[PDB]
Amino acid sequence: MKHVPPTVLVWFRNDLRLHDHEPLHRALKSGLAITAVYCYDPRQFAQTHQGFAKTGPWRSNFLQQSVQNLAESLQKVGNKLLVTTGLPEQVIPQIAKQINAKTIYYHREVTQEELDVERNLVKQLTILGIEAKGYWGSTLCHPEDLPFSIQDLPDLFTKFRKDIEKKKISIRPCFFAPSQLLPSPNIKLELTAPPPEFFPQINFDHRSVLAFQGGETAGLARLQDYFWHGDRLKDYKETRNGMVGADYSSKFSPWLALGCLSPRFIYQEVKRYEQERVSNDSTHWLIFELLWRDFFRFVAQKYGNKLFNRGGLLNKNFPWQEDQVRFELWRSGQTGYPLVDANMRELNLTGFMSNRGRQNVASFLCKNLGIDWRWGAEWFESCLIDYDVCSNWGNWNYTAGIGNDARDFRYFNIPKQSQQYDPQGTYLRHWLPELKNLPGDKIHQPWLLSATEQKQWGVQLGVDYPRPCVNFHQSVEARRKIE
Numbered sequence: 001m002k003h004v005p006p007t008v009l010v011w012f013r014n015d016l017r018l019h020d021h022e023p024l025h026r027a028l029k030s031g032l033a034i035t036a037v038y039c040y041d042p043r044q045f046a047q048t049h050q051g052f053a054k055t056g057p058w059r060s061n062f063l064q065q066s067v068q069n070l071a072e073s074l075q076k077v078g079n080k081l082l083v084t085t086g087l088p089e090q091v092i093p094q095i096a097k098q099i100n101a102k103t104i105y106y107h108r109e110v111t112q113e114e115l116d117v118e119r120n121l122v123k124q125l126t127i128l129g130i131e132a133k134g135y136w137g138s139t140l141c142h143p144e145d146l147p148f149s150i151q152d153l154p155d156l157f158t159k160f161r162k163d164i165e166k167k168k169i170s171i172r173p174c175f176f177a178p179s180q181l182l183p184s185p186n187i188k189l190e191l192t193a194p195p196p197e198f199f200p201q202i203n204f205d206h207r208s209v210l211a212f213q214g215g216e217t218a219g220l221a222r223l224q225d226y227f228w229h230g231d232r233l234k235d236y237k238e239t240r241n242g243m244v245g246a247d248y249s250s251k252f253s254p255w256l257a258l259g260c261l262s263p264r265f266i267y268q269e270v271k272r273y274e275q276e277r278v279s280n281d282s283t284h285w286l287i288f289e290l291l292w293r294d295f296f297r298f299v300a301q302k303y304g305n306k307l308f309n310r311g312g313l314l315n316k317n318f319p320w321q322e323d324q325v326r327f328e329l330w331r332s333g334q335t336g337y338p339l340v341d342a343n344m345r346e347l348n349l350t351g352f353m354s355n356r357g358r359q360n361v362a363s364f365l366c367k368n369l370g371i372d373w374r375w376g377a378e379w380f381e382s383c384l385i386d387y388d389v390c391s392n393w394g395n396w397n398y399t400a401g402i403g404n405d406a407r408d409f410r411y412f413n414i415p416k417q418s419q420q421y422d423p424q425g426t427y428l429r430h431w432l433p434e435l436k437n438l439p440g441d442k443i444h445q446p447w448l449l450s451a452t453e454q455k456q457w458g459v460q461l462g463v464d465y466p467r468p469c470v471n472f473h474q475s476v477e478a479r480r481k482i483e
């Protein structure tokens with residue numbers, strides 16, 4: 001009965017921030033009262049094909065904290081975040097009709113699940129005579145500024161990278177976070193708080209690289225610490241392949257995945273750092289990594305569902321084992337290969353794994369165990385606190401040899417990698433307590449321990465730590481034999 005003035009609605013998904021947010025910026029420039037909404041989608045809390053929770057505890061809790069921080073940032077600027085649950089394509093249009101929204105502003109995604117949601121949502125808006133404005137803001141490089149169409153995206157990262165830089169594409173400046181956002185008059189809406197079961201209680205492990213806190217505020221603080229307070233960006237290139245501690249890399253991933261941090265804002269800060277403190281290979285290398293992120297997003301956009309097919313991007317068959325027992329050995333980190341086990345346990349207990357670790361465990365599953373690569377991609381999807389559909393599935397495709405041609409079989413020598421990237425065994429002892437008594441480099445290959453060593457050091461293979469589940473050289477040559 002009360003008068004409901006026309007308004008605009010900003011729909012949030014994986015862009016939980018107020019800074020450099022084009023949809024939000026365009027909305028406020030309309031000059032109308034703004035309503036903000038986040039809708040927890042039950043489908044994201046169901047399961048993957050092999051049964052894993054689609055959104056595990058590490059990420060669901062990080063998400064809840066990110067949504068909560070966004071609600072607090074909006075309250076701070078005199079507005080509020082409407083939080084509800086259900087199918088967005090159903091809920092958002094319902095809210096829009098009720099609040100008399102004239103337009104919905106949102107960020108566009110590129111993968112099937114996300115694409116169907118926004119597509120069906122817009123269809124409902126169109127039926128109601130409500131406009132929908134979507135923007136591209138997930139990538140460092142705007143799709144419209146690329147020297148080529150998505151369909152023409154080069155298949156080699158190097159060419160992609162060289163083409164964009166050797167063209168001076170230029171990065172769009174960041175939009176400013178608003179200090180005030182006019183809210184519409186109070187309107188009674190039926191909002192459903194998300195079910196508690198979506199966020200199972202978490203047992204934080206202090207061995208974690210970081211006490212990850214979801215949200216834009218925590219994301220900005222982390223950048224502040226890594227870049228400025230700690231002044232460690234200058235050494236990024238030298239420490240990026242590390243595995244122990246919070247500072248061997250930015251740890252920006254979970255915040256970038258939910259859009260708590262804009263990649264263009266990070267880029268902006270890298271440039272500030274380069275001008276104020278130092279410009280070297282490290283400062284440039286971090287940008288290279290953001291480009292890899294962009295690349296996989298465009299690859300996912302270009303290839304669509306092929307990204308999730310058995311044959312991946314290259315549509316290459318390859319036989320794969322469906323050994324559930326061996327897979328659980330991998331997932332639980334009881335393969336008998338310390339580098340792999342330490343990494344898998346870190347993931348299981350913290351939701352995070354270093355890039356160097358991810359490359360090795362993925363290779364071990366595909367090349368050494370020869371198990372359906374998708375099973376590994378699914379576990380990462382479930383367990384990773386920084387899961388990004390494009391980067392995860394894209395990287396798994398490459399590792400499995402179904403994404404990047406490269407006329408040559410490729411595998412990681414786990415035992416070699418272990419000694420090279422954890423020369424003192426620090427990472428290993430950090431995550432594998434049972435091997436803490438091993439004082440020497442045999443910690444990298446415990447199967448080399450003599451009967452005397454196993455007894456003296458209290459490490460009985462088969463009891464305290466598992467025997468290698470596979471012969472390394474043999475497994476590699478066997479999987480390769482699949483020509």
Ligand SMILES: Cc1cc2nc3c(=O)[nH]c(=O)nc-3n(C[C@@H](O)[C@H](O)[C@@H](O)COP(=O)(O)OP(=O)(O)OC[C@H]3O[C@@H](n4cnc5c(N)ncnc54)[C@H](O)[C@@H]3O)c2cc1C
Binds near residue numbers: 388
């Ligand atoms: C099997 C496998 C699965 C992966 N799954 C994911 C995933 O779900 N989500 C995700 O964000 N990354 C994934 N990656 C890349 C991964 O290594 C993470 O980016 C992580 O290591 C980031 O930690 P950091 O933020 O400290 O990285 P930094 O080294 O500090 O790099 C900074 C940012 O660059 C981006 N980046 C770095 N390396 C890559 C890369 N290889 N591909 C894409 N972006 C990259 C990330 O957004 C990252 O936050 C995967 C890699 C492999 C080999």
